């Protein structure tokens, strides 16, 4: 989007500490704003499902430093 | 050092020396960490070879030590300067420096009115100082229940070898008033070291 | 020369000067020192090392009172004031956003090192030190108040937050307002050089 | 050959490579340096400006750099870094051209074509301000001063520089008030507040002892006659094999000089500037002791500097032997003044001296030399910026953003030039945009955002507007409270236009043997 | 100048010297006896039951041994005897405690044990003294 | 520092001593022989006596002392 991951995300943190409705980056508009009224629209289930898999593999594989293999 | 070796003169030109500074910066503050607080370990530190010093005070440690980098140098002042302030906060000022100078440049490099960046670490001090001016929540000798008695009693609880802090809560009250000397800004506070104090076996 | 006469100018005036030998040590004890107020507290102990023992215990009951008599405003000693300030200043950074959410938070995250290192210096499980303090520290309690609805205190010889709110091992607002800026300084202190070069 | 090709590139190598890390320019940016030298040292270094003057860089193209830096100082008093920040700017464009294969002498006059129109685009963005005007003089110096090490004393420093100029200035419009005219004279003690602006010639020399003449009717001049005596200028036949022969000449030595210093004070001399030449003695130590008995200000083997100002300002001429009395070619001085302030310092002040209408002597005082030098360096840029106003009338920006303002333009000017040079000048015409980011550059992490957008910002601010480098944000840089007289920046092009073009000339290498 | 050392590394170096010093003299001390014989670089033999006599004649390692000569003296400074006891006794507690206890991870009760292990001496001695 | 200790350390000693003595088996009685010793003087010193041989020229050993 041509932005500053440094500067912008905090602005959206700020605009979620000031706003906090949808305020977020638009790669489309190349700006930052409420994405729902920036019309960037996706279901929450995929995001719910993103969460479900997010921590899942995360918490999953971190439970293995103890790994076994038997190519033999 | 790190990265480009092409020019001497401690010119590593950016992040290299900057990191070679944060290295040196994270290098010097280490002794202080293990020496931080009264639970900070006590460092026997060789002065020459058989010449040694056993010190848990980073500032005192620093004073024997020498500064091999500006990163090593700029802290050994401010640490000994905060030591020069009192000696309370010697170890305090030391450590946080090593973290912020990889933090400080990262923002102030980007310019866009380059002046005001590290004031983000300053206004925070203000923001802190204000709150720091606001804390009677803990540490009150301003008034206790017995005031300077219990204040000393809890202080004689802060340093406690025994049930001392019974008479010794009162002695410290007796002590500050035992000393009467001109003290300025109007202080009834009178120096606590000069108190005439005698030991009886 | 001992041939010198004596005049009363070198005489001290007192209600009485009476000789009290106590402990098998005779002292000159001036009752009613007239031209100022005076006191001395003798320390009864098993030995003078036992007296060395409590005398030093007395000295950090002194300077703390003194430093309090120096500044009525104070803090608890240690990075526990950070533990409040840090997340608060990281919060105080948050709505700033941009550059400014970084600095004040990149500031306040660097605060945390002092007490936790001091904690593990006491082997206090620095996870504990943060667990206790910044729990109490909240939006519920953003509040130092004058009092404890949260505990912002850290005992230094303990390495662990205790319940001592009067203790003499803390520090006033004096050295702490200083240590902040000096810490902010070293962020700046190295940065003033303009350009760079090398010499022959 | 390859050597001419490579050595230029090798000259382009070193000089450019230096000029880059030579840009942290200004700012509180980049981490402080000790310097372990080429032959070794530990040199704790700061402020690339002085570092530029400190800079020893030794390489055929490195030596022109230290020069290039020092010139913009004496050219302006400012922009010391700024001449080099556009130096590596020129040093890049040459490559792509020589990488395009373009002939270096064809590349050479392109620098002129760049310098020719570049100063006019600078003259276009120049906001002309009066060179004799108290306010423009105040305000322009104020921007330097407020950026100098004392922004406080600046309030007292600027009118001094304003009045130092306006006295020394030629009336109405003038290119005048050099730094040669101005004689900046330190005085130990006093205050920065007690920094004194004297219109006349104050020689910084330390007057012999004290209690000497502070009175009026001086006669100051450099006197190359010597005070004769036995075993001084006068013949003796007596070798000393004994103690009495040693003493006899001395008894006649000090007495005869004691009557020579009278002739000096009889001349009307409350000062003398003693020739640095001696025979056995010239003016002896007792002689000065005898001259000071007569209240003749004496400094033995006077510094060559105050020798010139009194000859420059007053027009001093050689003087006849004291046994010949004098030619009264001691310069005209109505006051021999030794000021002592903070109880410190011995300062000859010659006031009522013959003066051209120029030669202000700013007396710089302070509780410490460091206290002295702060304002002294500050009032200098108060002098110089005003002097830059005097030498050239304008207020442009400082900080190098208006370079981008020249850059958008001079690009098209090449595009209009429509020559091979239109490719040569244009390759630099944009390449000059590099500085505002390279100022910022040397500090931190997460780098990229500001750099590219700066030149973009001004480019989106187009020709009339752009981002302020110091204060940030997009506003026309020329009038900000970031400002310079245009003289500052145009010389930076001039100086760099040439020394860089001088590299284009180098074919192969020689070493005078 | 500035130098930093850390962790077990020095404390293991602390373990080494005094403990290795604690070897021969513990066999030497008491009626059961041996001799610690220093080899001079020329082959010169110096055999004593006092290691502190041998320790000086050659390099004294910094971490343990530099303090042990002084706690050797201090004991002999005080009562007039005991250079050979304290070293092996300090070598004892030095040996097995920290690493084990630091593998159980804490500097604190280690230091604190010295106290309460010290007084149990004071306690059980003067009872059976 | 460099310390040889206990069982392995005394080996070189008993290795020296027993190793050093076995040369004197050429001595002690008429079936034994005078042992030739030479010094920096180059003096051939013929003694079946242990002392003469022993205290003049030998190989460096801790037991040799």
UniProtKB/Swiss-Prot annotation, chain A:
Assembly description: Component of the chaperonin-containing T-complex (TRiC), a hexadecamer composed of two identical back-to-back stacked rings enclosing a protein folding chamber. Each ring is made up of eight different subunits: TCP1/CCT1, CCT2, CCT3, CCT4, CCT5, CCT6A/CCT6, CCT7, CCT8. Interacts with PACRG. Interacts with DLEC1.
Family recorded in the similarity comment: Belongs to the TCP-1 chaperonin family.
Function: Component of the chaperonin-containing T-complex (TRiC), a molecular chaperone complex that assists the folding of actin, tubulin and other proteins upon ATP hydrolysis. The TRiC complex mediates the folding of WRAP53/TCAB1, thereby regulating telomere maintenance.
Entry binding sites for ATP: 47
Binding site for ADP: 42, 47
Span of the entire protein shown here: 453 to 524 of 543
Protein name stated in the entry: T-complex protein 1 subunit eta
Organism this protein belongs to: Homo sapiens
Highest taxon, organism lineage: Eukaryota
Subcellular location: Cytoplasm
Disease: De novo genetic variants in nearly every subunit of the TRiC complex, including CCT7, have been found in individuals with a broad spectrum of brain malformations, and clinical phenotypes ranging from mild to severe epilepsy, developmental delay, intellectual disability, ataxia, and other features of cerebral malfunction.
Swiss-Prot record, chain B:
Subunit structure: Component of the chaperonin-containing T-complex (TRiC), a hexadecamer composed of two identical back-to-back stacked rings enclosing a protein folding chamber. Each ring is made up of eight different subunits: TCP1/CCT1, CCT2, CCT3, CCT4, CCT5, CCT6A/CCT6, CCT7, CCT8. Interacts with PACRG. Interacts with GBA1. Interacts with DLEC1.
Residues binding ADP: 37, 89-92, 158-159
Phosphotyrosine found at: 181
Residues where N6-acetyllysine is found: 199
Entry-annotated residues carrying Phosphoserine: 6
Clinical condition linked: Intellectual developmental disorder with polymicrogyria and seizures: An autosomal dominant neurologic disorder characterized by a broad phenotypic spectrum. Main clinical features are developmental delay of varying severity, intellectual disability, seizures, and polymicrogyria. Additional variable features are non-specific pyramidal or cerebellar signs, and visual impairment.
Function description: Component of the chaperonin-containing T-complex (TRiC), a molecular chaperone complex that assists the folding of actin, tubulin and other proteins upon ATP hydrolysis. The TRiC complex mediates the folding of WRAP53/TCAB1, thereby regulating telomere maintenance. As part of the TRiC complex may play a role in the assembly of BBSome, a complex involved in ciliogenesis regulating transports vesicles to the cilia.
Family: Belongs to the TCP-1 chaperonin family.
Stated name of the protein: T-complex protein 1 subunit alpha
Positions of ATP binding: 37, 89-91
Modified residues (N-acetylmethionine): 1
Residue positions binding Mg(2+): 88
Curated annotation (Swiss-Prot), chain E:
Binding site for ADP: 30, 82-85
Related illness: Neurodevelopmental disorder with speech or visual impairment and brain hypomyelination: An autosomal dominant disorder characterized by global developmental delay, impaired intellectual development, poor or absent speech, and brain abnormalities including hypomyelination, cerebellar atrophy, and optic nerve atrophy. Some patients have severe visual impairment, dystonic movements, and seizures.
Tree of life domain: Eukaryota
Subcellular location: Cytoplasm
Assembly and binders: Component of the chaperonin-containing T-complex (TRiC), a hexadecamer composed of two identical back-to-back stacked rings enclosing a protein folding chamber. Each ring is made up of eight different subunits: TCP1/CCT1, CCT2, CCT3, CCT4, CCT5, CCT6A/CCT6, CCT7, CCT8. Interacts with PACRG. Interacts with DNAAF4. Interacts with DLEC1.
Whole-protein coverage range: 13 to 141 of 545
Similarity comment text for this entry: Belongs to the TCP-1 chaperonin family.
Binding sites annotated in the UniProt record for ATP: 30, 82-84
Record-listed Mg(2+) binding positions: 81
Organism from which the protein derives: Homo sapiens
Protein name in UniProt: T-complex protein 1 subunit gamma
Coiled-coil ranges (or none): none
Covalent cross-link Glycyl lysine isopeptide (Lys-Gly) (interchain with G-Cter in SUMO2), where: 3
From Swiss-Prot, chain F:
Subcellular location: Cytoplasm
Highest taxon above the source species: Eukaryota
Binding site for ADP: 29
Residues given in the record as ATP binding sites: 29
Disease with which this protein is associated in UniProt: De novo genetic variants in nearly every subunit of the TRiC complex, including CCT6A, have been found in individuals with a broad spectrum of brain malformations, and clinical phenotypes ranging from mild to severe epilepsy, developmental delay, intellectual disability, ataxia, and other features of cerebral malfunction.
Description of how the protein assembles with itself and partners: Component of the chaperonin-containing T-complex (TRiC), a hexadecamer composed of two identical back-to-back stacked rings enclosing a protein folding chamber. Each ring is made up of eight different subunits: TCP1/CCT1, CCT2, CCT3, CCT4, CCT5, CCT6A/CCT6, CCT7, CCT8. Interacts with PACRG.
Similarity field: Belongs to the TCP-1 chaperonin family.
Function according to Swiss-Prot or TrEMBL: Component of the chaperonin-containing T-complex (TRiC), a molecular chaperone complex that assists the folding of actin, tubulin and other proteins upon ATP hydrolysis. The TRiC complex mediates the folding of WRAP53/TCAB1, thereby regulating telomere maintenance.
Protein name as it appears in the record: T-complex protein 1 subunit zeta
Organism in which the protein naturally occurs: Homo sapiens (Human)
Gene assigned in the entry: CCT6A
Section covered of the full-length record: 11 to 75 of 531
């Amino acid at each position: 989007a041509g932005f500053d991951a440094t500067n912008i995300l905090n602005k959206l943190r700020a605009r979620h500490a000031q706003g906090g409705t949808w305020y977020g980056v638009d790669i489309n508009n190349e700006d930052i704003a409420d994405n729902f009224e920036a019309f960037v629209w996706e279901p929450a289930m995929v995001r719910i499902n993103a969460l479900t898999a997010a921590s899942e593999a995360a918490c999953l594989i971190v439970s293995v430093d103890e790994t076994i293999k038997n190519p033999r | 050092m790190e990265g480009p070796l092409s020019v001497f003169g401690d010119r590593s030109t950016g992040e290299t020396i900057r990191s070679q500074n944060v290295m040196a910066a994270a290098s010097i503050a280490n002794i202080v960490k293990s020496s931080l607080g009264p639970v900070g370990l006590d460092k026997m530190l060789v002065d020459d070879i058989g010449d040694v010093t056993i010190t848990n005070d980073g500032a005192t440690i620093l004073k024997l030590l020498e500064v091999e980098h500006p990163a090593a140098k700029v802290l050994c002042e401010l640490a000994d300067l905060q030591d020069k302030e009192v000696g309370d906060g010697t170890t305090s000022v030391v450590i946080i420096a090593a973290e912020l100078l990889k933090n400080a440049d990262e923002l102030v490099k980007q310019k866009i009115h380059p002046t005001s960046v590290i004031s983000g670490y300053r206004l925070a001090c203000k923001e802190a100082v204000r709150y720091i001016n606001e804390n009677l929540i803990v540490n009150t000798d301003e008034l206790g229940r017995d005031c300077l008695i219990n204040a000393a009693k809890t202080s004689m609880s802060s340093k406690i070898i025994g049930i001392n802090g019974d008479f010794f809560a009162n002695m410290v009250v007796d002590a500050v008033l035992a000393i009467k000397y001109t003290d300025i800004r109007g202080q009834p506070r009178y120096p606590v070291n000069s108190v005439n104090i005698l030991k009886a076996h | 020369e001992g041939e010198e006469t004596f005049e009363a100018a070198m005489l001290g005036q007192a209600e009485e000067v009476v000789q009290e030998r106590i402990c098998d040590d005779e002292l000159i004890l001036i009752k009613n020192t007239k031209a100022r107020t005076s006191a001395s507290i003798i320390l009864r102990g098993a030995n003078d090392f036992m007296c060395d023992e409590m005398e030093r215990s007395l000295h950090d009951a002194l300077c703390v009172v003194k430093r309090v008599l120096e500044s009525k405003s104070v803090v608890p000693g240690g990075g526990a004031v950070e533990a409040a300030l840090s997340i608060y200043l990281e919060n105080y950074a948050t709505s700033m956003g941009s550059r400014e959410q970084l600095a004040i938070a990149e500031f306040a995250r660097s605060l945390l090192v002092i007490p936790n290192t001091l904690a593990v210096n006491a082997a206090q499980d620095s996870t504990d030190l943060v667990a206790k303090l910044r729990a109490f520290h909240n939006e519920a309690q953003v509040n130092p108040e004058r009092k404890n609805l949260k505990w912002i205190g850290l005992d230094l010889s303990n390495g662990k937050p205790r319940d001592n709110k009067q203790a003499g091992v803390f520090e006033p607002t004096i050295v702490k307002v200083k240590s902040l800026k000096f810490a902010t300084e070293a962020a700046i202190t190295i940065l003033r050089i303009d350009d760079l070069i090398k010499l022959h | 050959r390859d050597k001419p090709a490579q050595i230029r590139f090798s000259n382009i190598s070193a000089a450019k490579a230096v000029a880059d890390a030579i840009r942290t320019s200004l700012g509180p940016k980049g981490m402080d340096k000790m310097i372990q030298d080429g032959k070794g040292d530990v040199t704790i270094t700061n402020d690339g400006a002085t570092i530029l003057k400190q800079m020893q860089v030794l390489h055929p193209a490195a030596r022109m750099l230290v020069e290039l830096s020092k010139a913009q100082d004496i050219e302006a008093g400012d922009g010391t870094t700024s001449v080099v920040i556009i130096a590596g700017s020129l040093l890049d464009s040459c490559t792509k051209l020589l990488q395009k294969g373009i002939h270096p002498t064809i590349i050479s006059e392109s620098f002129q074509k760049a310098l020719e129109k570049g100063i006019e685009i600078l003259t276009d963005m120049s906001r002309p301000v009066e060179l004799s005007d108290r306010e423009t003089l105040l305000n322009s110096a104020t921007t330097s001063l407020n950026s100098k090490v004392v922004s406080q004393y600046s309030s007292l420093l600027s009118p001094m520089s304003v009045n130092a100029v306006m006295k020394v200035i030629d009336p109405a419009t003038a290119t005048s008030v050099d730094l040669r005219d101005i004689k900046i004279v330190k005085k130990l003690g006093g205050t920065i507040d007690d920094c004194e602006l004297v219109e006349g010639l104050v020689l910084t020399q330390k007057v012999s002892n004290s209690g000497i003449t502070r009175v009026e009717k001086a006669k100051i001049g450099l006197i190359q006659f010597c005070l004769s005596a036995p075993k001084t200028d006068m013949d003796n036949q007596i070798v000393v094999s004994d103690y009495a022969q040693m003493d006899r000449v001395l008894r006649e030595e000090r007495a005869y000089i004691l009557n020579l210093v009278k002739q000096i004070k009889k001349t009307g001399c409350n000062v003398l500037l003693i020739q640095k030449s001696i025979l056995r003695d010239a003016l002896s130590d007792l002689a000065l002791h005898f001259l000071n008995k007569m209240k003749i200000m004496v400094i033995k083997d006077i510094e060559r500097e105050d020798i010139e100002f009194i000859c420059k300002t007053i027009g001093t001429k050689p003087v006849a032997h004291i046994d010949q009395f004098t030619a009264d070619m001691l310069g005209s001085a109505e006051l021999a003044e030794e000021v002592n302030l903070n109880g410190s310092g011995k300062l000859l002040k010659i006031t009522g001296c013959a003066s051209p209408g120029k030669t202000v002597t700013i007396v710089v005082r302070g509780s410490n030399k460091l206290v002295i030098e702060e304002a002294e360096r500050s009032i200098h840029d108060a002098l110089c910026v005003i002097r830059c106003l005097v030498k050239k009338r304008a207020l442009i920006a400082g900080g190098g953003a208006p370079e981008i303002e020249l850059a958008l333009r001079l690009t098209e000017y090449s595009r209009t030039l429509s020559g091979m040079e239109s490719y040569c000048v244009r390759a630099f015409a944009d390449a000059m945009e590099v500085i505002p980011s390279t100022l910022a550059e040397n500090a931190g992490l997460n780098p990229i955002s500001t750099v590219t957008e700066l030149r973009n910002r001004h480019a989106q601010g187009e020709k009339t507007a752009g981002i302020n480098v110091r204060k940030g944000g997009i506003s026309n840089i020329l009038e900000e409270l970031v400002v310079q007289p245009l003289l500052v920046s145009v010389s930076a092009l001039t100086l760099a236009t040439e020394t860089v073009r001088s590299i284009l000339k180098i074919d192969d290498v020689v070493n005078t043997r | 100048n500035t130098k930093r050392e850390s962790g077990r590394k020095v404390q293991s170096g602390n373990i080494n010297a005094a403990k290795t010093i604690a070897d021969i003299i513990r066999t030497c001390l008491g009626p059961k006896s041996m001799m610690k014989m220093l080899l001079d670089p020329m082959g010169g033999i110096v055999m004593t039951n006092d290691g502190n006599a041998i320790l000086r004649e050659i390099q004294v390692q910094h971490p343990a041994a530099k303090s042990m000569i002084e706690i050797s003296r201090t004991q002999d400074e005080e009562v007039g005897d005991g250079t050979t006891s304290v070293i092996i006794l300090a070598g004892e507690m030095l040996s097995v405690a920290e690493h084990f206890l630091e593998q159980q991870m804490h500097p604190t009760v280690v230091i604190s044990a010295y106290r309460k292990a010290l007084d149990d001496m004071i306690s059980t001695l003067k009872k059976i003294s | 520092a460099e310390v040889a200790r206990a069982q392995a350390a005394l080996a070189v000693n008993i290795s020296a001593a027993r190793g050093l003595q076995d040369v004197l088996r050429t001595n002690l009685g008429p079936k034994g022989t005078m042992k030739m010793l030479v010094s920096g003087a180059g003096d051939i010193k013929l003694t079946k006596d242990g002392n003469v041989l022993l205290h003049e020229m030998q190989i460096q050993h801790p037991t040799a002392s």
